[PDB]
Write a structure and sequence with these properties.
This is part of a larger assembly, with one copy of chain A (about 50 residues), two copies of chain B, one copy of chain C (about 160 residues), two copies of chain D, one copy of chain E (about 600 residues) and one copy of chain G (about 35 residues). Chain A has about 50 residues and is low in regular secondary structure. Chain A has no helices and no strands. Chain A is elongated and about 45 Å long. Chain C has about 160 residues and is mostly helical. The chains are: A little secondary structure (about 50), B mainly alpha (about 50), C mainly alpha (about 160), D mainly alpha (about 400), E mainly alpha (about 600), G mainly alpha (about 35). At the D-H interface, α2, α3 and α7 of D face α3, α10 and α13 of H. It is classed as ribosome.
């Protein structure tokens, strides 16, 4: 739970506010649209047994 | 009631062109009007 | 097996008529279920064995036809069953045997069997036989013109004309 | 007791509010411009308590259910005539109240009041501050149509016409196609990737959260479950009545289908207009406006689209260096880029599975799982295991 | 189609103008408007202005259309051409236009009639000078009689009207004078007797005079309010007025002077019973009184809001304001919670009482301003509209339903008229020539055989083996027993809800905001239905072997797949996409 | 001390905020209530029977 | 040309002027009816 | 040319089928006359049937309210737009119970309700039957025979129709409900509730509705009597009947017009005394009719006579009580229900339809409502342009699917009773799948002995099922009929829109044959289809 929104810190000066996530969208199994914890920017949990 | 339109159940009796024309099985009025519309058309066509 | 089952419903007792109605209704449900099952099984074999449809990747193909959509339709039964042998013959698109039967008609002028087992025999199961008009029911009016006048087979002449 | 009062009003052929404006009763289109109870709730605060229609199809549907229930409202009316004549025949108050009592029992008038059942204290607060049982039974007003709704068949047909349904499918197709285009473009300029990387950048600052010494307890307390851990909702400053009512009525007003919108506007304008007309010339007027409306809006959409994706061309057609001349700006959408992108996806592609001779591209689950389902059996299985909350094999 | 503050035609102008009759002068038009048959409809200057202008315009229209059709021996939309006459399609379209326009006119007119007998301000006076017993009795039994729940109320209405009239005589316009013929003509019953059963007593009338004088009654409206509130236990309370009512001394004094000065020409208790209602309409002797009553309803109705004069009665006549209060919250909540749950911890109890007081404050504070701003926003089709929203109170105001049925018929006629446009007129020929360049291809260019439709889903949710069984065999038979009909009704009701949810999700699927909310409607629906199915399934299997019977045939169907966890997309079919993505699409709003 | 013999507070599957519920139709809202009522009734009754 | 015509038609919807209305006199006991004179 | 041939086909088929239908109608009416004759021997008669003049409710200034003394003696003639009062005598037990319970009747809600229910128990059906001259009958016989000859010649010319005849007959002998001078004019009242007074005001209209104007001459009123206790389900042959003596009918308007004006216009003085004059002769002019007639006016203020006459002659301001008991909805769907009910009662007279109209439409509007109601997806607004305007080639397959599913879901009911003499009967409710939603046996009808084998009951349920499924097939036919036919026009004459029409037709056929051939390969290959890449084939050719 973090906003990708533009920050005023000196080191955060590279950060550009993000467009909202693509609505009906089919991701690659290792990613996500970064909305929530249930759906991260990078998926760590394996899908195997 | 009284109108000019054939008395039938089948929709197939009301079938015509898209230009609203019937050169077959149309009434005499329908016949003349249609042939004259078409004549108008091909006239302007071969004229130009 | 009346020998066994008669006394279940009583009879000297008086008839249940609750039990009887229930078992009738249930039985019919079993039959219907069997029919729909059969139709779907047909579809399933079809889809599993077809490569060109497997080419476009669609789950939808499996759900876009089911016991509701497929044929035979139940609410259409009447017009197909109540028909005369002649009528049934022309419905399913065999014009040959229909014309034949009509010439033989003019010149001379609880049962167990589905009424349609007379007209439709094991030879009209072969997909090779089925006339082009009948194949895709939805479009039957429009595909009937490509057909031959008296034949079931496609007339090249009519088609070559239309194209020409 | 109140129920007999309501029935008493459903019996009379006169409007129970007498057509008068009451700040607490919204006369709703969806309900057939009928006087529904819509108080402002200050527990929520600033909010009128009442359904807000979010789509035109809900409107169409409600209208259709009225048209459907016509027959029943009519039998109800010929029943009501009988009733109130039988009321005229009664000379005393107590016997009249007996009649209204038993009949309000019979038409289930009491069942039309929908009370919140939540045993939870906070939900109780939301509802019962402004809107309560003591209040709802007191303020309730029944139209004939809400009564007929209870004894009647359920329509399996929504009022959506053939052609309206065509319009639906095309609206949906258009919008979706435009959103996928948009997203694929966000992927092309690479703003997605920059978004991910920037997330990585932001991570540098954050701590690991304190989850508590007893973690069950902490999690639970955070959610407000344990005993005496319940927190009240932050108190919201109520918004001006004009704003609340603009919200509520703006909702329904947005949803109104073309025909009704144009028609209402046309008659109500026809009263005060410079050169009014009745009969056919009125009708004609309507149609043309309607027939213009479509074209108008339709045209507009395209322009908007061409501004969004930068469609059309940059300069004049005949420029010295060819027609093709174009300029691309860093992160701007341009037709060239849209059709290039699309070209990239499928060029000579005959079918979606074209590359599936390659076993590793074959089983990639990216696009979906749909191409790896072959026989019915596996699809039943997949259905089964998705319903059991397990993973899909 | 009608809105607040809108004029409708009550006259048929078309029938005469098709015959060739027309007017030019204002006087000709005034000769056109007036009704020979007994009734007399007065008008505002405004409505007459509008009606005249409309008339003139109809003149221009029928003229330019008759002239147009004489020159060719309406005008096509910009890209269209006129099909030949005596072509099936054109005759079809023109028949449709004819019928639809007819219906539209019938609707505009009937809605006008509704306006007229609703006593809308642009129809100020309905005069009865020309009527005879037949007309008066019909008028009564259509307008007054049929609507009234209380028979005794009618007599009271008549008498109050008679007292209002007899007292307010100076300020009336000249056009009213005739009615006084009836007022003094009123027949009364001998003071305690052949008229005992036929006519009411004078004493009652004088009670009503007392009401008129003490309360200053100027209207049919204030008369309605007063007549509804006077017989109740709170009377002095309810009818207490903004200008304070006079003291009974002076009033009973002027009533003694009136009564006595009326004897020489030839705290009062609410009166006794009255003769059975039928008498009023079916006896000659009461014909004057009856007349008064009608003149009572169709006139004497003025705009002004009666609740400025009687602010105490606004809660009784129409519903009270919700913001106006006529124990502590924590105790109500503890009572709805019951004794089976722990009593509220007293932190939370305290905090909740705090909220109750704060909200109380908000209500008291916003009470007046909300009223003010609401009327102010209504004065400003537009988002705020109605059949009747007006600031003023109308006791004759029409039911919303009667107007709405008209409006619906009207929109039907409107779509019907717009339908004919493509039968009458056609596209350019070579344009449809180029339209047949691209054929309709079964696979792509055609719309898919599954659209969103209610019976599509209702067939999908009925297609499930468990639901099919539960429907046909499983539940006890619907016709046989009561439990049967009950169960059946509810199961179909829940299936229906779930279907509706799926459907409304399917239409709006393209936009996020809406789909999430719809999807929650779904979740609720599915939860309901699943609970029902599970419950009744358990019932079937537990209830009290023999081959192929109920319980065996149930057990053969396996485990029941919940519709809750079912993942169903746009088309009502299980999704193509991976479970995570679907889970994300249908994730609740925030 | 307070909580010993009492029931656990009902947990209604798919319980909604007032923010979503504002978009429910009168009929649909009636349905929602139906759901809640039946869930709560069932659970508290289950507690009674168990205890 | 067609779209131009329809636009020109939706310019004719906003071009509406208001015919002067005519107010009557408000009395307590009735509604005053004036006629064309 | 093909289109015209098709239309011609439908017209001919319609003729032949109807022709095959009539004799069933004859046998049915005969059997009904028979069973009615059996029942009416044993039961309670309606003895006095008397038409009289209406009696004024209004009292003179000296008279007292209580008497109701005058019923009127009799009436020799009934005007067309005028009300008459019919008096009957029905001694049926519920009527007695009502006279006693009412004459005992200061009022309670209870007894009011009791009286309402007792009223709902019995009811009377009042119709108008017209005599016929020998001339009219000979002209009818002549027309019927002309039609029969036309049908016989068309049957002889085109053989397949002579076959379709036998098809039709055998179909009717299946579908039909098995049952085991004067000619009808108008239905005045469908349902008359029971009175103590035994009298009803009836308004005769100007038009019996098929839309026609009414004849003149001899009419007598026919009264049928239905007590729901002895006859639930309202079988037409079980009822009590009585006839009024002959009276005559005509339209009184031209005589009274000629009498008053001694006629295009009326001056406006005379209008109100003219309507008064009319009400005095017995005619019925409502107040609304007067008003709106009055509201259409000449430059002189004149009421057009033809306008007023048109309003007096039509359904707007007044209706027969039979038509005032039916909803706008019922009146709007009535032609469909007619057609259907006519299929299941093959060759019925408008007499029968008059009797069963009420029950049929009511049962329809309750249980059947989904089938009959106008369905914006399924329905056809216009037969002429239906194929063009409302139905797109795009929306066609979706439309058809819609029809399918809606019929699949919906429900039909059917009934059967044992012909073998035990009163065993069954009712069945059935899905679009031919599945059974409900089956119920009714033991109320039959004798108390109830000696029946499981076999008989099985046959009973069988017949019940059969009828039910059939009812569903007919219902389906009507719901899905119009759009299917206009579909047929679209597809047949609009081929040149689709891929299988015109220049591409030849492609379609090609594909088609390939498919057959291809399928055979898959049959030979073990149902593992050959390579899409065609790497399997032996030759490059």
């Amino acid at each position: 739970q973090t906003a990708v929104n533009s920050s005023d810190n000196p080191m955060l000066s590279s950060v550009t506010t993000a467009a909202p996530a693509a609505d009906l969208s089919r991701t690659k199994p290792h990613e996500g649209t970064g909305t929530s914890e249930r759906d991260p920017y990078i998926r760590t949990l394996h899908n195997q047994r | 009631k009284e109108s000019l339109l054939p008395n039938s159940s089948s929709p197939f009796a009301y079938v015509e062109d898209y230009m609203g024309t019937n050169l077959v099985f149309g009434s005499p009025v329908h016949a003349k009007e249609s042939a004259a519309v078409w004549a108008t058309y091909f006239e302007r066509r071969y004229a130009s | 097996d009346k020998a066994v089952w008669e006394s279940f419903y009583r009879k000297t007792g008086s008839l249940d008529l609750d039990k009887l109605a229930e078992s009738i209704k249930t039985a019919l449900w079993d039959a219907t279920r069997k029919i729909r099952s059969a139709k779907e099984a047909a579809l399933h074999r079809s889809l599993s064995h077809n490569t060109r449809m497997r080419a476009s990747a669609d789950l939808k193909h499996w759900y876009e036809e089911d016991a509701n959509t497929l044929r035979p339709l139940a609410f259409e039964a009447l017009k197909h069953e109540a028909a005369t042998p002649w009528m049934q013959l022309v419905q399913h698109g065999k014009k040959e045997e229909a014309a034949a039967l009509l010439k033989e008609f003019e010149q001379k002028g609880n049962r167990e069997q589905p009424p349609l087992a007379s007209t439709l025999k094991a030879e009209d199961s072969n997909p090779a036989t089925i006339p082009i008009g009948s194949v895709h029911p939805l479009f039957t009016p429009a595909l009937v013109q490509i057909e031959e006048a008296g034949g079931g087979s496609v007339s090249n002449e009519a088609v070559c004309r239309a194209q020409l | 007791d109140w129920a007999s009062h309501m029935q008493r009003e459903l019996f009379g052929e006169v409007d129970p509010l007498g057509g008068q404006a009451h700040k607490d009763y919204y006369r709703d289109v969806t309900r057939g411009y009928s006087p529904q109870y819509a108080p402002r709730n200050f527990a929520n605060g600033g909010a009128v308590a009442y359904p807000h229609i979010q789509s035109p199809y809900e409107y169409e549907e409600a209208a259709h259910r009225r048209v459907w229930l016509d027959h029943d409202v009519d039998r109800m009316r010929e029943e009501f005539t009988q009733h109130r004549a039988s009321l005229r025949s009664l000379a005393s108050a107590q016997e009249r109240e007996e009649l209204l009592r038993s009949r309000a029992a019979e038409y289930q008038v009491a069942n039309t009041v929908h009370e919140s059942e939540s045993v939870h204290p906070i939900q109780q607060l939301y509802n019962s501050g402004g809107t309560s049982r003591s209040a709802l039974k007191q303020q309730a007003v029944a139209d004939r149509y809400s009564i007929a709704e209870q004894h009647s068949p359920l329509p399996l047909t929504t009022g959506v016409d053939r052609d309206a349904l065509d319009e639906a499918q095309r609206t949906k197709d258009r919008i979706l196609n435009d959103s996928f285009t948009a997203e694929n473009l966000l992927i092309t300029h690479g703003l997605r990737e920059k978004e991910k990387h920037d997330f990585t950048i932001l991570q540098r600052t954050v701590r690991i959260p304190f989850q508590g010494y007893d973690m069950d307890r902490f999690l639970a307390q955070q959610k407000g479950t344990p005993y005496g851990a319940q927190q009240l909702p932050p108190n919201v400053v109520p918004s001006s009545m004009e704003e609340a009512q603009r919200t509520l009525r703006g909702s329904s007003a947005t949803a109104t289908p073309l025909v009704d919108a144009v028609a209402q506007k046309v008659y109500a304008r026809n009263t005060v207009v410079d050169r009014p007309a009745i009969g056919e010339q009125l009708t004609e007027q309507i149609i043309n406006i309607m027939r213009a409306s479509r074209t108008t809006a339709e045209q507009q959409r395209e322009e908007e689209r061409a501004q969004r994706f930068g469609l059309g061309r940059q300069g004049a057609l005949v420029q010295d260096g060819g027609p093709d001349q174009r300029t691309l700006k860093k992160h701007t959408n341009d037709e060239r880029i849209v059709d290039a992108m699309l070209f990239q996806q499928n060029a000579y592609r005959k079918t979606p599975t074209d590359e599936h001779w390659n076993p590793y591209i074959r089983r990639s689950t990216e696009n979906g799982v749909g191409h790896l389902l072959q026989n019915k059996f596996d699809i039943m299985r997949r259905e089964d295991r998705l319903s059991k909350g397990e993973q899909d094999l | 189609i009608t809105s607040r503050g809108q004029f409708n035609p009550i006259h048929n102008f078309s029938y005469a103008m098709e015959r060739g009759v027309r007017a030019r002068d204002v006087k000709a038009f005034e000769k056109l408007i007036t009704n020979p048959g007994p009734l007399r409809v007065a008008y505002t200057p405004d409505y007459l202005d509008w009606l005249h202008r409309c008339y003139k315009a109809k003149g221009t229209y029928m003229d330019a259309r008759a002239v147009a059709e004489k020159k060719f021996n309406g005008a096509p939309p910009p890209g269209m051409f006129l099909r030949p006459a005596h072509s099936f399609r054109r005759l079809a379209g023109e028949l449709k236009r004819r019928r639809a326009q007819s219906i539209l006119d019938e609707v505009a007119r009937a809605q006008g009639m509704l306006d007229l007998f609703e006593r809308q301000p642009h129809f100020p006076a309905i005069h009865i000078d020309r009527c005879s017993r037949f007309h008066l009795v019909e008028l009564f039994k259509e307008m007054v009689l049929e609507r009234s729940l209380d028979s005794n109320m009618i007599w009271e209405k008549a008498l109050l009207y008679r007292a209002i009239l007899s007292e307010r005589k100076p300020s009336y316009p000249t056009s009213f004078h005739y009615i006084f013929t009836a007022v003094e003509d009123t027949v009364f019953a001998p003071t305690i007797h052949p008229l005992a059963a036929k006519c009411p007593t004078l004493e009652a009338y004088y009670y009503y005079v007392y009401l008129v004088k003490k309360y200053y009654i100027d209207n049919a409206v204030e008369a309605h309010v007063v007549l509804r509130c006077h017989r109740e236990p709170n009377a002095a309370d309810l009818l207490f007025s903004n200008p304070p009512p006079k003291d009974d001394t002076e009033i009973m004094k002027a009533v003694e002077l009136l009564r006595n000065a009326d004897i020489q020409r030839g705290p009062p208790v609410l009166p006794g019973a009255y003769p059975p209602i039928d008498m009023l309409w079916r006896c000659e002797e009461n014909l004057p009184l009856l007349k008064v009553l009608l003149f009572g309803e169709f006139n004497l109705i003025v705009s002004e809001n009666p609740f400025v004069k009687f602010p105490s009665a606004h809660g009784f006549l129409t519903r009270p304001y919700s913001t106006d209060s006529s124990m502590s919250l924590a105790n109500v909540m503890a009572e709805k919670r019951g004794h089976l749950l722990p009593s509220l911890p007293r932190n939370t109890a305290t905090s909740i009482d705090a909220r109750a007081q704060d909200i109380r404050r908000l209500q008291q504070k916003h009470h007046r301003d909300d009223i003010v701003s609401f009327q102010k926003l209504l004065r400003t089709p537009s988002a705020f509209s109605s059949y009747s929203d007006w600031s003023y109170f109308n006791p004759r105001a029409v039911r919303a339903e009667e107007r709405d049925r008209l409006t619906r018929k009207a929109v039907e006629a409107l779509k019907l008229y717009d339908s004919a446009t493509n039968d009458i007129y056609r596209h350019s020929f070579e344009d449809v020539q180029a339209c047949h360049t691209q054929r309709v291809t079964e696979r792509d260019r055609t719309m898919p055989p599954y659209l969103p439709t209610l019976p599509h889903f209702v067939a999908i949710i009925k297609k499930d083996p468990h639901i099919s069984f539960l429907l046909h065999i499983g539940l006890p038979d619907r016709n046989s027993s009561e439990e049967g009909s009950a169960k059946h009704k509810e199961l179909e009701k829940r299936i229906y809800y779930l279907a509706r949810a799926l459907y409304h999700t399917a239409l709006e699927y393209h936009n996020e905001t809406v789909r999430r909310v719809n999807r929650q409607k779904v979740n609720v629906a599915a939860s309901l239905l699943d609970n029902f199915v599970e419950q009744e399934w358990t019932t079937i299997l537990r209830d009290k072997d023999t081959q192929n019977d109920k319980k065996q045939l149930a057990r053969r169907l396996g485990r029941y797949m919940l519709f809750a966890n079912r993942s169903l997309d746009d088309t009502g079919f299980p999704t193509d996409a991976r479970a995570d993505d679907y889970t994300r699409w249908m994730a609740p709003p925030s | 001390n307070h909580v010993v013999g009492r029931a656990p507070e009902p947990v209604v599957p798919h319980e909604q905020p007032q923010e979503v519920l504002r978009h429910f139709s009168a009929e649909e809202r009636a349905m929602y209530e139906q759901h809640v009522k039946e869930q709560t009734s069932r659970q508290l009754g289950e507690w009674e029977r168990a205890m | 040309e067609v779209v131009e015509r329809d636009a020109a038609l939706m310019k004719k919807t906003l071009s509406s002027g208001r015919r002067l209305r005519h107010r009557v006199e408000s009395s307590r006991t009735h509604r005053n009816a004036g006629s064309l004179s | 040319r093909s289109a015209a041939n098709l239309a011609r086909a439908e017209d001919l088929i319609h003729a032949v089928v109807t022709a095959a239908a009539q004799p069933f109608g004859e046998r049915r009416r005969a059997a009904t006359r028979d069973l009615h004759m059996e029942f009416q021997r044993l039961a309670v008669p309606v003895e006095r049937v008397i038409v009289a003049n209406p009696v004024s409710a209004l009292l003179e200034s000296g008279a007292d309210p209580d008497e109701k003394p005058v019923e009127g003696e009799k009436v020799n003639m009934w005007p067309l737009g005028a009300k008459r009062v019919v008096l009957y005598k029905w001694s049926a037990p519920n009527v007695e119970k009502l006279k006693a319970m009412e004459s005992d009747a200061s009022l309670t809600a209870k007894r009011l309700r009791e009286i309402q229910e007792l009223k709902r128990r019995g009811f009377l059906e009042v119709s108008l039957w017209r005599r016929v001259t020998a001339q009219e009958r000979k002209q009818r016989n002549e027309i019927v025979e002309a039609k029969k000859k036309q049908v016989e010649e068309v049957v002889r010319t085109v053989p397949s129709l002579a076959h379709l005849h036998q098809y039709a007959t055998s179909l009717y002998s299946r579908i039909e409900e098995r049952v085991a001078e004067w000619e009808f004019a108008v239905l005045l009242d469908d349902r008359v509730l029971l009175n103590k007074e035994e009298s009803v005001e009836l308004y005769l209209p100007y038009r019996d509705a098929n839309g026609e104007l009414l004849a003149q001459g001899e009419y007598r009123a026919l009264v049928r009597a239905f007590d729901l206790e002895a006859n639930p389900n309202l079988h037409p042959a079980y009822c009590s009947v009585g006839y009024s003596e002959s009276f005559q009918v005509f339209d009184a308007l031209p005589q009274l017009i000629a009498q008053f004006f001694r006629v295009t216009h009326i001056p406006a003085a005379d209008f109100t005394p003219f309507c008064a004059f009319l009400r005095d002769a017995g005619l019925d002019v409502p107040l609304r009719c007067e008003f709106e007639a009055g509201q259409a006016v000449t430059t002189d203020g004149d009421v057009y006579m033809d306008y007023f006459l048109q309003l007096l002659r039509g359904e707007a301001f007044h209706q027969s009580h039979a038509q005032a008991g039916l909803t706008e909805a019922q009146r709007a769907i009535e032609p469909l229900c007619r057609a259907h009910w006519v299929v299941h009662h093959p060759g019925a007279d408008e007499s029968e339809w008059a009797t069963a109209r009420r029950s049929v439409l009511d049962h329809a509007m309750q249980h059947e409502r989904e089938w009959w109601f106008p369905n914006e997806m399924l329905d056809v607004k216009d037969v002429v342009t239906g194929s063009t305007n409302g139905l797109t080639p795009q929306m066609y397959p979706a439309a058809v699917r819609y029809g399918v599913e809606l019929c699949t879901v919906l429900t039909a009911e059917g009934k059967f009773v044992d012909e073998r003499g035990s009163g065993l009967s069954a009712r069945c409710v059935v899905n679009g799948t031919g599945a059974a939603e409900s089956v119920v046996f009714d033991t109320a009808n039959c004798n108390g002995t109830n000696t029946t084998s499981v076999e008989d009951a099985l046959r009973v349920a069988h017949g019940a099922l059969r009828s039910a499924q059939d009812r569903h097939n007919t219902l389906a036919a009507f719901r899905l009929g119009p759009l299917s036919k206009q579909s047929q026009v679209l597809l047949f004459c609009g081929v040149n829109a689709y891929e299988f029409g015109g220049k591409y037709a030849r492609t379609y056929a090609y594909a088609f044959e390939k498919a057959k051939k291809e399928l055979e390969a898959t049959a030979a290959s073990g149902f593992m289809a050959p390579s899409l890449s065609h790497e399997d084939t032996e030759r490059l050719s």
